[PDB]
């Protein structure tokens, strides 16, 4: 029927650098997220894993609420408290019915501005690092993506989202306090809210999120290039080949995003043959055992990685990899139809819009935009920018990949998995 | 493996070979963790039949008579399948493997391909090694000539 609205996103930057953005959608539930420039890239070789344990410690005792209270109080109202990390940011998000946002907000503030990191609570938590990591590492993709970043960069973005085994049991209360004081500061934060009033949200930030000091510093990520091979016998080999692309936000980044969809970036039809996936069709022409391939695109504040990811039976790894590469090579040599670029743009544009239709997807996008560019760019504009990409730009992004120094990671029985210098 | 790996040198030398070669000499002297518990009786029988052959062996003896030693070899060490399933040339590749683990001390090795043992060039490398310094000569000395 006739929906009430649609209202507009409200945006505010406080004198201390903190950004506050919100949208009153009149939903029955509210979503609040505190986004912080505290991802693993900010760890150095002396405190690796600190942000991982920090991610697992949102429930420990704080100055205004005991560990027991945080859990019982949030559960009493049927709410949620979660922590999401990327190599660049950490997002503390809470969910609850709109009449209980005062309860959740208070717990969120206590967790992010008043954690106590009690020695005994921190010690008891160390074991969770092993469980959390083992669960994540059951996915070969996690192995490969983590190794790929370690191989591509000399620092920062090179850091894993997971605590190194040697550090489990060694992360100290002091390292946690310092990590919070160094990075959980106003100039590094963005409070985002859905189903909440902006004045209220704003007033909360002004009263409880004025945290001075810390570091808005951060060493550029130095792309290096290299390869990490993890022999482990699986019948299937997982591999990723990339080159440095572009920092998120830049125009060149949009060309890489278009190139990714030209190439093939994930299924569109359940059990389909991926008729319009350039990479998939090329590989299918030459290999006849099961396999999968997809363009890979990761964009960060000061760098980016673009290439492809492949999964194939061990004996066919080289065939699949070279075939995928040759296909990117043909694009770099100018072989690209305007229709294909149009199809690609369609996929990218629809994919983007679908990614922000859920409250969760929307919050992440706003939050990410708030920290990466201290502003909000609406869909209409994003689509325009996507349309603005030229076939020439796509061909050029492809050239950059082909001629760029590569980074590679593979895991499985690598007897037939080629080294970068054999590609 | 755990006993051997308490020595950081073992870590480093094993990784250096894995980084230097594409195959063969790239293999570790120690079983990969993922393979522990998976090495089968069949793989062991096969490895022995493939490599423990007369054309691939040398029986050496000290404090023993050569005729006796010789007769023993002739009677019990005539193993066919001989020459066995030999290997391929070791392909030097080059590269680096970094193992972050926090010890106060860093162990590192930097190398380049030199020469096969036996060749004359190998002797020059052996001399170069001693010119550079290849281990202590005096207890607690300053290594004046290293």
């Amino acid at each position: 029927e006739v929906p009430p609205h649609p209202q507009d996103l409200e945006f505010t930057r406080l004198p201390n650098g903190l950004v506050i953005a919100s949208l009153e959608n009149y939903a029955p539930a509210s979503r609040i997220g505190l986004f912080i420039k505290a991802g693993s890239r900010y760890e150095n070789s002396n405190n690796l894993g600190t942000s991982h344990l920090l991610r697992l410690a949102s429930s420990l005792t704080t100055k205004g609420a005991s560990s027991f209270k945080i859990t019982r109080g949030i559960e009493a109202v049927g709410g949620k408290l979660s922590v999401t990390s990327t190599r660049e940011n950490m997002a503390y998000t809470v969910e609850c019915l709109r009449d209980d946002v005062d309860i959740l907000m208070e717990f969120l503030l206590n967790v992010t501005t008043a954690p106590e990191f009690r020695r005994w609570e921190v010690a008891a938590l160390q074991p969770q690092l092993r469980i959390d990591k083992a669960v994540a590492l059951q996915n070969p993709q996690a192995h490969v993506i983590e190794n790929l970043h370690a191989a591509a960069y000399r620092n920062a973005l090179a850091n894993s989202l997971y605590c190194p085994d040697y550090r489990i049991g060694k992360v100290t209360p002091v390292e946690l306090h310092d990590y919070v004081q160094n990075h959980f500061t106003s100039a590094r934060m963005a409070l985002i809210g859905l189903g909440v009033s902006h004045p209220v949200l704003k007033q909360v930030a002004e009263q409880f999120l004025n945290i001075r000091g810390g570091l808005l510093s951060g060493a550029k990520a130095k792309y290096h290039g290299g390869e990490i091979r993890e022999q482990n016998g699986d019948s299937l080999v997982h591999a990723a080949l990339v080159a440095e692309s572009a920092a998120i936000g830049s125009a060149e980044a949009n060309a890489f995003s278009v190139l990714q969809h030209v190439l093939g970036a994930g299924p569109h039809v359940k059990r389909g043959s991926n008729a319009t996936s350039s990479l998939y069709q090329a590989v299918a022409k030459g290999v006849h055992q099961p396999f999968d391939v997809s363009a890979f695109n990761a964009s960060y504040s000061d760098s980016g990685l673009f290439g492809f990811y492949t999964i194939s039976q061990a004996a066919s790894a080289g065939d699949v990899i070279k075939a995928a590469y040759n296909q990117v090579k043909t694009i770099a040599q100018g072989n690209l139809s305007n229709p294909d670029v149009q199809a690609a743009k369609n996929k990218l544009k629809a994919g983007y819009l679908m990614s922000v239709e859920s409250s969760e997807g929307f919050l992440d996008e706003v939050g990410s935009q708030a920290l990466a560019a201290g502003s909000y760019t609406p869909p209409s504009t994003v689509l325009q920018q996507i349309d603005a990409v030229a076939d020439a730009d796509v061909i050029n992004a492809a050239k950059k990949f082909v001629s760029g120094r590569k980074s590679m990671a593979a895991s499985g029985n690598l007897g037939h998995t080629p080294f970068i210098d054999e590609l | 493996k755990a006993v051997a790996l308490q020595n950081p040198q073992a870590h480093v030398i094993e990784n250096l070979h894995a980084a230097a070669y594409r195959n063969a000499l790239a293999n570790s002297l120690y079983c990969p963790d993922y393979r522990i518990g998976k090495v089968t009786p069949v793989e062991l029988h096969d490895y022995v039949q493939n490599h423990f052959t007369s054309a691939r062996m040398a029986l050496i003896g000290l404090g023993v008579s050569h005729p006796v030693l010789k007769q023993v070899a002739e009677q019990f060490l005539n193993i066919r399948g001989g020459l066995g399933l030999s290997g391929a040339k070791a392909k030097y590749h080059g590269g680096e493997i970094r193992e972050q683990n926090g010890d106060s001390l860093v162990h590192a090795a930097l190398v380049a391909e030199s020469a096969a043992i036996g060749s004359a060039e190998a002797n020059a490398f052996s001399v170069l090694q001693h010119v550079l310094g290849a281990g202590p000569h005096v207890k607690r000395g300053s290594n004046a000539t290293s």
Partner: protein, 42 residues
Amino acid sequence: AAVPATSESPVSVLCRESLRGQAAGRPLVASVSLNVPASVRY
């Protein structure tokens, strides 16, 4: 929260159909919750 995760953790593929979608395509993200199974995307 109230909703259980898509996959509850503890501590497949044999066809090309079930393999499509397995290849990664974006940077990794790790999530931890109070009430929901952890996840790692990409």
